[PDB]
Amino acid sequence: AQANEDIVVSKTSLWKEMQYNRDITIRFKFASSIVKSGGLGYKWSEISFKPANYQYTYTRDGEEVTAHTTCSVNGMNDFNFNGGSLPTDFVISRYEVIKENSYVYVDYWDDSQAFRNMVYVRSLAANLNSVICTGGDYSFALPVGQWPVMTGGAVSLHSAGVTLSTQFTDFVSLNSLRFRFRLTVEEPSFSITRTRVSRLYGLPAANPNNGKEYYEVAGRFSLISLVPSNDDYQTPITNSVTVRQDLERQLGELREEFNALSQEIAMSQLIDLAL
Amino acid sequence: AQANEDIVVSKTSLWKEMQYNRDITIRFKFASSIVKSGGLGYKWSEISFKPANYQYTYTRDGEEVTAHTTCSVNGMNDFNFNGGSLPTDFVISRYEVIKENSYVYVDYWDDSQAFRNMVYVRSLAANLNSVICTGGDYSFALPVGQWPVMTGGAVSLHSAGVTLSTQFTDFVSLNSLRFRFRLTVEEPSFSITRTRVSRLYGLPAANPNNGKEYYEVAGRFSLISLVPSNDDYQTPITNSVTVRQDLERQLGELREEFNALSQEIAMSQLIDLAL
Amino acid sequence: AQANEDIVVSKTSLWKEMQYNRDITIRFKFASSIVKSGGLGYKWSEISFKPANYQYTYTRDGEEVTAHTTCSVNGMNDFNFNGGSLPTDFVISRYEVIKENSYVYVDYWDDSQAFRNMVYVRSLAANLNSVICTGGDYSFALPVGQWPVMTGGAVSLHSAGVTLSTQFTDFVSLNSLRFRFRLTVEEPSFSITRTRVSRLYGLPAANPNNGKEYYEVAGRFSLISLVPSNDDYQTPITNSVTVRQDLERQLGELREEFNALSQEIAMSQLIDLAL
Structure with a gap:
């Protein structure tokens, strides 16, 4: 066997069943939609996740392979904090946070032969090592006074079932493999300073x-x-x-x-x- | 014979022709887009139809079917009403009304075997009884004065030809059966009180x-x-x-x-x- | 041998390979989004190309073909002008111009037999003649003062490689032929009065x-x-x-x-x- 096998499990005059085995590097990225309300500037409409594309290239075993991975979230938790009711009070109407009840969908597509005509797939299986996504520091540009910062927040992504998905971007419609990731909340917590x-x-x-x-x-x-x-x-x-x-x-x-x-x-x- | 047969009409090494006959409970819904023009709030920019998804789950004969139905309107007629150019007068620049000349589209998809890999379909035929869609009472909000309520409006959807379509949502792209409905207006009449x-x-x-x-x-x-x-x-x-x-x-x-x-x-x- | 043959190069019980040769009349257009800033009204946020749909019908040999085309631009240069920082000064933050370094994509689909089940295509080749596209006159409607008009601009679209693609709209998803055009600047030149x-x-x-x-x-x-x-x-x-x-x-x-x-x-x- 080999890390990038290409087996012919069946062939016909016009069609063939091809078994593809591949080792891939899935590089995914988060995208945040931040909407700020009107007025003084102490109110934020929302801070939510949105699907994020990322096209990259990496070296396989002797090959330069170009991949396209899109990330999204499901089962998000909407939290709300209020500093009061006055126009001057800092307040966020809602914001999405990822918890143990959430899932992360990372759908990966590649220019290899395993994806060229992927319309029907069976016996789909995968292995994925867990990782950690740590939350960074985001500052709020308040009109006056101190600047709050949302710092911290870590979730460990663990492999879950893999399935078939489609990446629909403005340029390319790709038939991709959707890797599902469960989450466990880790020691680094997030706080609003x-x-x-x-x-x-x-x-x-x-x-x-x-x-x-x-x-x-x-x-x-x-x-x-x-x-x-x-x-x-x-x-x-x-x-x-x-x-x-x-x-x-x-x-x-x-x-x-x-x-x-x-x-x-x-x-x-x-x-x-x-x- | 059965109400939910799965017949075979041809088979080969890698492909086959499956004749699916199924009873379905198409549950659809309307989505209204309301744009209200700026100013004192005495005018509305548009009241239009838009595609509306509805994902439900109903019990067939001994099994549970998760269905996804998307409704749309075609040939909508543009009516309008303005009392004058004064800012403080009721004005609806353009609102959509469904009449006989229009059509109603209902895409329908299921998780049953008939939709697993529906990419090519032939001899597509269907039977489908009529339904009656009545109009609700939508109130128009103004800063001061009366509240004209748009009430009434009923139309019978009668079955028409059936084709294939695709439901494109933010989460699922589904090859689906497109049921087309002609319209006959019923006794109730829509009017703004x-x-x-x-x-x-x-x-x-x-x-x-x-x-x-x-x-x-x-x-x-x-x-x-x-x-x-x-x-x-x-x-x-x-x-x-x-x-x-x-x-x-x-x-x-x-x-x-x-x-x-x-x-x-x-x-x-x-x-x-x-x- | 005629201009619109559909030859059978292979056939099996459930699938076949068909050679479709067709002479077509691709009619396309450019769609531009003009975004205008606030303020006094002397600042245009941008003037950018966007995908442009166009559905038409043309007479083939004895039959009428309903065609759908979608034009797009890739690698468009962005040019900015700012006469002065004052609010009343004319400003265009960025407008898109297509040059030799840019490409024009044109997706073309028909209701003919060549596109009915176009999901897998090989041996794709084309013969396309070049077309001269010249810009028109656009007037910047300033609040008070003179209205500058941008006039001129001419390029030649020369046929380039042809591939497959798909046109997605609010009504139809069409697997289509993507004709690529390279650009050569022509004698007429665009300028702003x-x-x-x-x-x-x-x-x-x-x-x-x-x-x-x-x-x-x-x-x-x-x-x-x-x-x-x-x-x-x-x-x-x-x-x-x-x-x-x-x-x-x-x-x-x-x-x-x-x-x-x-x-x-x-x-x-x-x-x-x-x-």
């Missing part, structure tokens, strides 16, 4: 990557794919996405309204400033 | 669901699908979607601009409280 | 279409597709889409914030105007 909250275990979305370029997991997978026998057929990969046109229309109308209102406000201020 | 619009037939987008958790229609479908012979292959079902990155960037840009403007307004209002 | 910028080549995103219905290019392609033997088999074409729910929720929250702020501003003007 200068706030009445601390020593609570999890990994908030404020700064999951903690300044790290990525989180790397060395995995292995073995699958059987039903692909055309001729190794020339190529499934469409590159994409032209024009989804959610109604959302674009709403964004345009909202921007038009905001532009008109801001134009009126700016004129009403400049007339006074022109004394 | 305390307003000069009444005796109008159709189904508006204000509150299509009428407070119902779902609209349920019983269906049956028979189809022949070209599926891999081994009942262990799996087409990707879940998804990791990061499309419309430019739209996210524009949303962030406008959020930043609005935050700046709101902070400016807050500073201006706070300066007026010094003495 | 009443500005110290001119004699620089490219195709600015302000008005690539030159106020024209479409850019038409006659092409031909030959491909070998692995499709089900029975032609009654159909893959999904239409889709129901609910992608980017987080985006819609954030847009709704932003709309609520804007409505609250605008109502507050309008009430402030009303009370300030009440003597």
Whole structure:
């Protein structure tokens, strides 16, 4: 056997079952959507996770292989902290934190032959070593006074069942292997500095990557794919996405309204400033 | 014969033709998009239909089926109502109403064997009884004065042709059966109370669901699908979607601009409280 | 041998390899998103290319072909101009221009037999003639003063390698042929009136279409597709889409914030105007 076997478990005139075994380096990354409310600047609408893409390249055994991994979270816990009700009080309406009840979906795709025409897969199995994602420090740009910082928060990712997924980005639609990761809250806890909250275990979305370029997991997978026998057929990969046109229309109308209102406000201020 | 047979009509080494005949309980739902124009709040930008997902789980004959149904509207008619150009008058720039000339699409997918690898389908036929969708009572909120409530509106969906489609959500991409419904307006008439619009037939987008958790229609479908012979292959079902990155960037840009403007307004209002 | 043959290069019980040769009329267009900042109204946030859909019908030999095209731009240079930092000074933060270093993608799909089950394709080749795309006139509608107009800009799209891709919209998902075009700058040059910028080549995103219905290019392609033997088999074409729910929720929250702020501003003007 070998670390990157390529076995033919069946063949036919037009189709063939190919067994692919591979050792892969899954480098995944977190993306945080931070929405801040309007007013003085002491209110934050939300700090949540969103799916994050990451395309990279690494050296296999004598080969330069280009991979694309997208990370996402499920079963997140929404926490809320209030400094009061006045406009000056620091308050976050909600923010997502990862706990033992959550899952992390890291779907990995590669340019190897194991993914070229992956439309049907059976006997899918994998091995994955656990890792630790430690929470970094994220500071809040308050208009006045001290700056709170959300520091800490570690979760150990442990391997779970692997399945089949699809990465839908604006450029490429890829048929990927979704590795599911369970989480265990670890000793490094997260606390909001200068706030009445601390020593609570999890990994908030404020700064999951903690300044790290990525989180790397060395995995292995073995699958059987039903692909055309001729190794020339190529499934469409590159994409032209024009989804959610109604959302674009709403964004345009909202921007038009905001532009008109801001134009009126700016004129009403400049007339006074022109004394 | 059976209500839920799994017949074989052809088989080869790697592929086969499965004739699936199944009874289904299509539970669908409407989604209303409401955009309210800025200002005193006496006008609404748009009241439109939008695609609506609904994932449920119902008991078939001895088994539990997890179903995912997505509803959409086509050919919607654009009505409008304005009392004048005065800011303090009721104005709906454009709202969507469903009439006979329009159609209702319902994509339906199940975790049963009939949808495991549905990529190719032929001889797709179905039977599907009609349903009645009545209109709810949606109230319009104003700073002061009366509250015109849009009430009434009923339309009967009658079964029409059936095709194949794809349900694209934020979590799952599903090859599904698209049931098409023609429309016949029923006796109830939608009208805005305390307003000069009444005796109008159709189904508006204000509150299509009428407070119902779902609209349920019983269906049956028979189809022949070209599926891999081994009942262990799996087409990707879940998804990791990061499309419309430019739209996210524009949303962030406008959020930043609005935050700046709101902070400016807050500073201006706070300066007026010094003495 | 005729221009629109569909030859059988292989056939089996359930699958076959078909050689489709077709002469097509690709009609495409450029879509541009123009984002305008707030303030007095002398700052455009950006003028950027975005994917552009266009569905049409053209007469083949004795039959009408319904085609769907999607244009996109890759590797577009970003040019910025800032005459002065003052609010009243004209500014365009960044606009996209396509040069030799840029590429134009055009995804093309038809209701013909060549695209009906296009999931696996080999031996793909094409013959496409070049087309000249010239930018039109776009006027910057400033609040008060002169309106600069950006006029000119001409490039030649020369046929490049052809591959597979997929067009995703709010209505259809189409496995399609991706024609790539390289760019060669032409004699006409884009310039902005009443500005110290001119004699620089490219195709600015302000008005690539030159106020024209479409850019038409006659092409031909030959491909070998692995499709089900029975032609009654159909893959999904239409889709129901609910992608980017987080985006819609954030847009709704932003709309609520804007409505609250605008109502507050309008009430402030009303009370300030009440003597």
